[model samples]
Target: STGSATTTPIDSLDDAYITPVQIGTPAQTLNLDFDTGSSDLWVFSSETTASEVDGQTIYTPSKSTTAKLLSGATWSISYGDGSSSSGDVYTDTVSVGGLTVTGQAVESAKKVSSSFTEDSTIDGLLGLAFSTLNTVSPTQQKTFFDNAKASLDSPVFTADLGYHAPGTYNFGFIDTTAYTGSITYTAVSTKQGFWEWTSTGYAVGSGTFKSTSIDGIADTGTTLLYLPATVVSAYWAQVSGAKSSSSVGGYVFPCSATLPSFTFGVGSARIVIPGDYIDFGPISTGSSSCFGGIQSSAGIGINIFGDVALKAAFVVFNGATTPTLGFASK
Candidate 1:
């Protein structure tokens, strides 16, 4: 049967989005961060040290009749933001929306970094990246999407993220009603195990388009847009009061400041992010200082198209052929 499953993503604190998924027999539900940045379906579990566990719901594989342990198998991962988690592996029945994948490699975390422990909203990360990025030892694990693609109607998934509001993630199909206008498709280079693509250039306000090629990854786990330092500086130059703050970090501006729209290129089409979106809300409570959503990717070395940039467009993650990305204004 050709069908698709759509999961409404819960917009969490700040800019994070969580998707509900069921694991194991009898279906123990967990809210997972559907991360396109890294590939690992790990969860806080019974295996986690009591001290490491906080408010996160734990998945107990022992109770699942279908659970199978791969002896000596282990997995560990570290994120660009310094968050990390590691633990043993278990094969279980994992389901997203109504799509189920049997014998899926689910990593049960025995240890988690402070970031994971503090973030109580998500149990773990449901990796949306290529399976090659999986961290399992001896044998790499296939992602839930990888395991279920063969059974899907089409080898595609779409992320329709919103600003502090509910969004939907559609698998094996695209929801036409979720977006308007024609989607402009662009080829992606996955050599680094990411949805990496080159943008033709960018423009600020009503300025002429600059054709500097910018290579970056489409990362849902990341919250802000990170670009080359030069590009970051140039955009900030346009805003009068915008300054790089050491105390607050990144570029900060007055809440009352008027900002120009930022535009990026995709083939012949251009997607523009409103200046209001660039404000990124306030950085601290009871303060008028607001952080710029677009910052420098200097340390990471790779530019990132985070939720700040993705939300402006309805994105299609196509795994069918060359792994292309199709974008349309939402």
Candidate 2:
């Protein structure tokens, strides 16, 4: 049972387009996952077995703006937390933000274990994080930012993480309005696969991590921050005190406060987050104080820094043009 009938390869059309291009064979309109932990865009195609995905979106290359196949290619993606998946490789003209790059190679997983997959709003993932994961020849490979550095209007990319915090991608100047007028920048480590940074402390309620301190490793791939136990407990203390607060699975507080203003201590830098982001908690619970901003990472081990901390800071990746990261005040 294919989705769209007019399957023609070599074109990328948005949902509004009546004639959507095909990608991965027997194509369908698939929303890709935007991740920063790893540099790859993967999708579950129509070629996947039914048992693998009950109602997954299958894509036909015929409808793609451009479709190129890499026969017998297999892939396995492992996260910093050891979570991973396996699949094959293919190429297509993926239409992203009104930009199209031909011969874009991608991985197509037959199976995935992301939490969002349970109630998927999309068929795959698109990673825009800074790292070296591509198989470009000449012994020198670059990431989306590396390849995009030359084309982007400004030497910046702005991310507009949607209302639900779905984490959007802005390949060029990061939107500065989300944080304080001053964003202290951190230098790239030149080591490790993911983007790492240092943090001073977090600010919450009417308190701050003055004597308290913390570190951050910005990753667009992982979903939430992996705050230390001390940091987690401290942040939640204020949140729990706000209103009818109680600990829940993830960070969810009552919307009782105007907007809990919190900042990440990024090494001599403090990036402030908007109250709009803090108030995503359920309206029914008014349990705003309970959320520590940093949640428990008991079994799913890994200390991670998610978009919540990175989104507020205007980040600059010099992979394509240089070899370091620069932070600008937003």
Candidate 3:
């Protein structure tokens, strides 16, 4: 493939997803979250000392269709949030949503953070984020998405993330038209490719959209959109008696009723946030229903769009095309 320039932020840092490799001849399976920020295929294994975590399922490779150890080398991960863990590496056939990649590198963590080991939260992280961030760093290493793309019906792969409302992440094809607006695309580049966009501003209930433009980054690893302090405070200013409190690594507004209907702009295209997504903050005690998705972030320059802002909006990633985004209603 020839190198091409991107007009918008491309989704290509070569993404990968990490999942427990249910290995066996008959082929095994594991449920995983396809994360896009980092790449490291690790599984919780029985080999892990029993003291590591309680009630967490340790993946037993012997029960799989096929399994092979990757020289029994140990690997570790350190997160910016100060979370870390270690595990042994194994090469096995890993499958996600029916797509299989053979001899894929995976790690079986001996210990994990409470947040990571908790059930229903996630047993594994299938980093569909970036190949460069792969902990294995193998030659000719193929990411889950890279391997799955060939088998998919569409050249473009999309991740549908729903944090609160039926929180989910989906992959596969994208339709151009949706419940909101038409898709617009930016070109791809050699730099970080995150399907980024320059959001022109927001809109309110039956009113025109604000003309402010904010540069935003879409990430799977990050939980909330980090907005600058000024914007965060200004936004809460309108919410009747809305007060800002520092918590959860950022500013969260308490009074959310002032939250007006908001619309997101991508170039000339506009995407309206469903009422459910606009108020990302948790409801206050003794208060009526509060917004869940649109809480504020202060002292921020880089605007990280959380999954809340992207719900119902299908983002198309085309590495083969002239670097552009195709939007549709999910």
Candidate 4:
């Protein structure tokens, strides 16, 4: 059977998308972040120390008759944003949309950093990255999509993430009617367990486009678009009163500045991100200072086309023989 889900923003804007998932017998549900950046299906659970669990929902394994402990197994992970979690492992039936996955490895958090525990909205993370990145010890784990793909009509899923609105995530099938124009497909290299690709070139504002092969990952978990330091400097140059602010930890400028549109090319297709979107929210409420959404990925190993970039297109993550990214205007 085909399964699909509605992805709603954690906020009015698209910083992240949360999907509903049911775990174990009797099916207790939780809202999880469908992150394409990492692989590991973990949840806030009864195993988590009370001090570590706050207002978030918890998945109780003891209460579920279907839960089975993967004895001696453990898992832990850290995010680029400095958030982290570590826990024990359990095998249980997990379902997403209408797809029921049996004997799925579910990690239960025993410890979490403030970045996760304080933010009560998200109960856990559902990773869509390659199974190789799964954190389960003694053995790697496969994602729900990976387990369901073989039985699917099509080994594919589409991320229709929206800006300030709700979107859809379709598994096992691609709804052709969801996008306009043709989807420009590009080969993906999963060497890093990420949907990595190279962009032919990019343009700053209305400036003449230039050639610069940029290798990066498509990360739904990341909020900003991080490029090379040189490219980041060029984009900020076009904005008046823009400056590198250590106070805000990146580039910040006057809130009234008219930002320019940035464009990046993937194969023969050109995707443009409007200027207004670059003017991220204020650094502090009622302050004239605001942070720029685009930054340098210099120290991060590789650049990232995060939510800032992904929301501008309709992306298809094809898991057939060769993983590929199909992009089209939303």
Clashing pairs in 4: none
- Tens-digit per-residue lDDT, 140-250, candidate 2: 234445555666666554443333423334555455564445545565553555555556667765664564544455664454567766656656556544432233456
By summed lDDT, the worst window of 10 consecutive residues in model 4 runs over 8-17
| lDDT digits (tens) for residues 106-214 of candidate 1 | 9999999998888777789999999999999989989887888888888988888876677778788888898888899999988999999999899988989999899
The lDDT per prediction is 0.86, 0.51, 0.54, 0.88
Best by TM-score: 4
Model 1 bad stretches (over 4 Å): 1-13
- Models 1 onward score TM values of 0.95, 0.70, 0.75, 0.97
Error of 4 at 142 (Å): 1.0
- Candidate 2's displacement at residue 105, Å, is 1.0
Find the candidate with the highest lDDT and give its number. Answer: 4
Model 2 residue 326 CA deviation (Å) reads: 5.2
Ranking by lDDT: 4, 1, 3, 2
> Candidate 4, TM-score vs. the true structure?
0.97
Q: What ranking emerges by TM-score with the best candidate at the front? A: 4, 1, 3, 2
Candidate 4 positional error at 146, Å: 1.4
